[PDB]
Amino acid sequence: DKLNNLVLFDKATYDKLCKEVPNYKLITPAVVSERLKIRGSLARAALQELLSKGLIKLVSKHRAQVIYTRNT
Amino acid sequence: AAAAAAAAAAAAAAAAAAA
Amino acid sequence: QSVQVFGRKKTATAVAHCKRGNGLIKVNGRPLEMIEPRTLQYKLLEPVLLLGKERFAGVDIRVRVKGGGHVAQIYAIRQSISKALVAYYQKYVDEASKKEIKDILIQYDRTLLVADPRRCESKKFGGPGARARYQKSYR
Amino acid sequence: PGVTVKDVNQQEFVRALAAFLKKSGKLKVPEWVDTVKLAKHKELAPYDENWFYTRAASTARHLYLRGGAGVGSMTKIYGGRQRNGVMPSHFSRGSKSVARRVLQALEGLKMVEKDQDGGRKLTPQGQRDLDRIAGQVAAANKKH
Amino acid sequence: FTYRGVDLDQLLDMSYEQLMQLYSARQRRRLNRGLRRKQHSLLKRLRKAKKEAPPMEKPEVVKTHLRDMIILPEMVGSMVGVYNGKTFNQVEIKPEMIGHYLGEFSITYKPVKHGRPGIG
Amino acid sequence: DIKLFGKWSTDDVQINDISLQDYIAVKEKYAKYLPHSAGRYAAKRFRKAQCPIVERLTNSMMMHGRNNGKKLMTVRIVKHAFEIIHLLTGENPLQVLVNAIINSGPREDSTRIGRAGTVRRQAVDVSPLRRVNQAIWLLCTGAREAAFRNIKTIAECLADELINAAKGSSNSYAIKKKDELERVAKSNR
Amino acid sequence: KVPKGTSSYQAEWI
Amino acid sequence: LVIPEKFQHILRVLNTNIDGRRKIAFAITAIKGVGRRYAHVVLRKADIDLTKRAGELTEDEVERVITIMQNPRQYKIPDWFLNRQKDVKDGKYSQVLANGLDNKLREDLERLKKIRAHRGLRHFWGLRVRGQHTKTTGRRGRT
Amino acid sequence: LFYDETEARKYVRNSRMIDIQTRMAGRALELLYLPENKPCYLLDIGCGTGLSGSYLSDEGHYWVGLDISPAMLDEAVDREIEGDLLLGDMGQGIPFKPGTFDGCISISAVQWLCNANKKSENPAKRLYCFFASLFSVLVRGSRAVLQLYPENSEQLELITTQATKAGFSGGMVVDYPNSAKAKKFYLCLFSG
RNA sequence: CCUACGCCGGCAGGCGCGGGUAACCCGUUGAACCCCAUUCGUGAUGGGGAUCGGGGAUUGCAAUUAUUCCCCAUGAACGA
Structure with missing residues (x-):
């Protein structure tokens, strides 16, 4: 049925997005979007924030596919 | 030289078209 | 002191003018990274990455491109650069290293130095193009 | 080794030339900047609040790429794919008045010169400026 | 009644030049093109038929072919037969139709009200 | 030397099945920088056995109607998919691709033999080249129908289905249809 | 409420 | 982004329930009489950044939007x-x-x-x- | 196996499928002279999601539906049917006592008896098993009307021959037969 | 009548000014997809734009049964 994913952050949503993301082996806005009920716009802006957090490596960067990677 | 090169290229193109 | 050759796909013509130079590769005044179908850059980089840039040491390579589409022009530039280096080493250097680089290119891919045998052909009357024809109805 | 505008990534050059026209600040800006599309063959408004600036930059650069192109040729460059509803798409051209008055506004900065040849081309001031900013983005390329 | 912020006495006292901004695109278009002599003569017959009527009475209906006539507001109050191929339909020109044609008031065909298929 | 996409290695790649060992050409002189070859390979018979494997995964991915000339979207989907597999595993993803094609093609196949009205099938052996092509078509189809309506990019879908079939999941549509034809093979015989 | 002017034609459109 | 704390999950602008979490340049289209181009040329004179959503707004922004929206000539929506x-x-x-x-x-x-x-x-x-x-x-x- | 949940849903929710199945079911009922103008008890054979069975309910009939597909039956569950739905392979037989039903109807289903995939009896055996049991479970003078899609004339002749050997008489009605896009074959039979 | 160029039109279009009775002038026939960034984030949603209400401009004796084009607003069906 409805894939009305969460448009903005929440308490526990950010408690997983600041925390669980650098332990994935693969950080993709579709994957982060898909596991925690988040729109790809929201996860896309959040992953550019994770560039601004400096935790997470940026490997690939394209039009619609921007690949992030957990560090070490 | 550049002009000459350009001319040559044009000629080649023409030839190709003919072919 | 100069060699003047070309490369030809469907409509794309690539005029190559090479001589003794500095390693200069201009494609109507732009490098081999500044062509927007950029993934095919690697195909566009196949004359350098297969042969090594040390063999492109002192050669001026001017490229002037006509007609075609973007992918056809990329394969035409690839074509013309490979034929230009081979024709330069044949006319001005030995037969042996030219033959060797010919054997490096062809056994990788023959399409690098030979032309393509087919084009968007003309039409014999009776349809949209040459092969498929118009459609009808029954009953 | 006088650097060439053609020897740079062109869209990073467009973004930097937009920033250069933003830092200049002097230009006769029209009033339909916040109203219009580029032409009939698009649907929605542009998201850029400075879309006039970056289009002026790209228009100056397309004048740099060839001289002998009038407003109708500037209309013809900025074309695209009109979707005719359920009827199939076609090529549709730019807007005359907007591209004409972009050329007019940059003509105000002595960067666009009318010739005897009917069209409009770049000024020698213009090619000096574009080669300066070309060296700026060339140092932004081969030294970054 | 009011049209475009202008009243009926205001319209009927307004000149022929100033009408030509108060209309639709096609209507200002045609009034720019300028009317024909046939429609001038039809408006003249309308003047004669609207004037000679008794003051209690509505004017005598004038029948006409010209479906492509702009309904001028000067025609309001008359009765006009409009020819749709077969039958002059007699319309009282009310002031609500000053921006339309006569041709829409005599509806030309008969509405399709289906039957049933036989051998299809 | 020659590495895929500038970086990816091919000399580590190993074939398991001898029965499919020649009909995938990846190892030594069929490694190229890009899948975009743009030469003829359907010239005559079996000349699409000596074309590269990633070129086959590319050219069998513009399959659907609206994508039917847009090969550059396909090669960036291939590039993003190899990068996603290289993140989720760490190994050379070409080994994952070879292990996915090997573990997915059918082994017996049913063919209607009789007349037009005698559907009395007979489960026969699978040709190796058709095993290759059936495997590639199943992997592309699992990438298609699991990426019709989702948030996932089709590169992610292809990469995850290639992972799941490389390990033989119950999740891969390709392994599901392989098991289906292998179970139909049990029935017709 | 058929008008006194018009025919049965437009009245069948009514 | 951030977590805007004044987030009305329901908007009510001119007798219309608006899904306030939707994008501001596409939630004004939801009412009749306003499409996509029109709400954009409103917002370019309504001085609100497109980056925000429709539930991230101040009522001062809401009242100036409705002010421009009912007075379209006075705020250069010609x-x-x-x-x-x-x-x-x-x-x-x-x-x-x-x-x-x-x-x-x-x-x-x-x-x-x-x-x-x-x-x-x-x-x-x-x-x-x-x-x-x-x-x-x-x-x-x-x- | 042929259907799944996705495909059963897409078939039953398609408006064009609904309209054509409804038209053919109403045509089959018109050809069914035994329920036509009569109350009756019915067996719907290859009932699917109950698109044909709903239209039996419209004329006041009580019915049992047989289908081999779980997903077609599961989709039928949510459609407020009044008939009894049964998961069953028609080629193994009709599992009711002698003389149970006034009539039987089948829309778009019996051509599957020419298919040899599901079971290891010959289609010829399953076709005989279907018609012989179908004759038995029907009352005396009962009727069977089957809209079906034959691949060729040999399939039509085989179906006719098996029905004939089982004790049925009647014939074939072909509606719109000059359009092989829109033509429809109806088998119209009666028992002894 | 094919147009270039300039001026005036938020968009369709006007006004002035040449070449071209023609591989020349339009013409280097400067296109679309494609690409690179932005936004959207799987729902009838910004997909699909039908179905309409206001206007605006051309074509023409003549646009009413919408000639065509443009600008708002409307947003049904459609889940392969």
Whole structure:
């Protein structure tokens, strides 16, 4: 049925997005979007924030596919 | 030289078209 | 002191003018990274990455491109650069290293130095193009 | 080794030339900047609040790429794919008045010169400026 | 009644030049093109038929072919037969139709009200 | 030397099945920088056995109607998919691709033999080249129908289905249809 | 409420 | 982004429930009488960044949006983005929104019924108006 | 196996499928002279999601539906049917006592008896098993009307021959037969 | 009548000014997809734009049964 994913952050949503993301082996806005009920716009802006957090490596960067990677 | 090169290229193109 | 050759796909013509130079590769005044179908850059980089840039040491390579589409022009530039280096080493250097680089290119891919045998052909009357024809109805 | 505008990534050059026209600040800006599309063959408004600036930059650069192109040729460059509803798409051209008055506004900065040849081309001031900013983005390329 | 912020006495006292901004695109278009002599003569017959009527009475209906006539507001109050191929339909020109044609008031065909298929 | 996409290695790649060992050409002189070859390979018979494997995964991915000339979207989907597999595993993803094609093609196949009205099938052996092509078509189809309506990019879908079939999941549509034809093979015989 | 002017034609459109 | 704490999960602008979590440049389109281009040329003069959503706003932004939205000439939304250019009554270049939109559609239909024109009887009967080729159509919605 | 949940849903929710199945079911009922103008008890054979069975309910009939597909039956569950739905392979037989039903109807289903995939009896055996049991479970003078899609004339002749050997008499009605896009074959039979 | 160029039109279009009775002038026939960034984030949603209400401009003796084009607003069906 409805894939009305969460448009903005929440308490526990950010408690997983600041925390669980650098332990994935693969950080993709579709994957982060898909596991925690988040729109790809929201996860896309959040992953550019994770560039601004400096935790997470940026490997690939394209039009619609921007690949992030957990560090070490 | 550049002009000459350009001319040559044009000629080649023409030839190709003919072919 | 100069060699003047070309490369030809469907409509794309690539005029190559090479001589003794500095390693200069201009494609109507732009490098081999500044062509927007950029993934095919690697195909566009196949004359350098297969042969090594040390063999492109002192050669001026001017490229002037006509007609075609973007992918056809990329394969035409690839074509013309490979034929230009081979024709330069044949006319001005030995037969042996030219033959060797010919054997490096062809056994990788023959399409690098030979032309393509087919084009968007003309039409014999009776349809949209040459092969498929118009459609009808029954009953 | 006088650097060439053609020897740079062109869209990073467009973004930097937009920033250069933003830092200049002097230009006769029209009033339909916040109203219009580029032409009939698009649907929605542009998201850029400075879309006039970056289009002026790209228009100056397309004048740099060839001289002998009038407003109708500037209309013809900025074309695209009109979707005719359920009827199939076609090529549709730019807007005359907007591209004409972009050329007019940059003509105000002595960067666009009318010739005897009917069209409009770049000024020698213009090619000096574009080669300066070309060296700026060339140092932004081969030294970054 | 009011049209475009202008009243009926205001319209009927307004000149022929100033009408030509108060209309639709096609209507200002045609009034720019300028009317024909046939429609001038039809408006003249309308003047004669609207004037000679008794003051209690509505004017005598004038029948006409010209479906492509702009309904001028000067025609309001008359009765006009409009020819749709077969039958002059007699319309009282009310002031609500000053921006339309006569041709829409005599509806030309008969509405399709289906039957049933036989051998299809 | 020659590495895929500038970086990816091919000399580590190993074939398991001898029965499919020649009909995938990846190892030594069929490694190229890009899948975009743009030469003829359907010239005559079996000349699409000596074309590269990633070129086959590319050219069998513009399959659907609206994508039917847009090969550059396909090669960036291939590039993003190899990068996603290289993140989720760490190994050379070409080994994952070879292990996915090997573990997915059918082994017996049913063919209607009789007349037009005698559907009395007979489960026969699978040709190796058709095993290759059936495997590639199943992997592309699992990438298609699991990426019709989702948030996932089709590169992610292809990469995850290639992972799941490389390990033989119950999740891969390709392994599901392989098991289906292998179970139909049990029935017709 | 058929008008006194018009025919049965437009009245069948009514 | 951030977590905006004044987030109305329901908006109510001009008798319309608006899904306030939607993008601001696409949630104003949800009411009748405002499309996509029009709300954009509103927001370019309503001085709100497109990056935000529709539930991230201040009511001061809401009241200046509705202020510009009911006063379209005074805030440089000139006379071609308007829903109605020249009305039958006043000819006033003016935007018309949802309740008044259905009201003025009903007004024009009642007028053309009262006019006894070629359009008005079509609109009373609920048929095609622009002269269509119905030799194969007229399928869904006819009984 | 042929259907799944996705495909059963897409078939039953398609408006074009609904309209054609409804037209053919109403045509089959018109050809069914035994329920036509009569109350009756019915067996719907290859009932699917109950698109044919709903239209039996419209004329006041009580019915049992047989289908081999779980997903077609599961989609039928949510459609407020009044008939009894049974998961069953028609080629193994009709599992009711002698003389149970006034009539039987089948829309778009019996051509599957020419298919040899599901089971390891010959289609010829399953076809005989279907018609012989179908004759038995029907009352005396009962009727069977089957709309079906034959691949060729040999399939039509085989179906006719098996029905004939089982004790049925009647014939074939072919509606619109000059359009092989829109033509429809109806088998119209009666028992002894 | 094919147009270039300039001026005036938020968009369709006007006004002035040449070449071209023609591989020349339009013409280097400067296109679309494609690409690179932005936004959207799987729902009838910004997909689909039908179905209409206001206007605006051309074509023409003549646009009313919408000629065509443009600008708002309307947003049904459609889940392969």
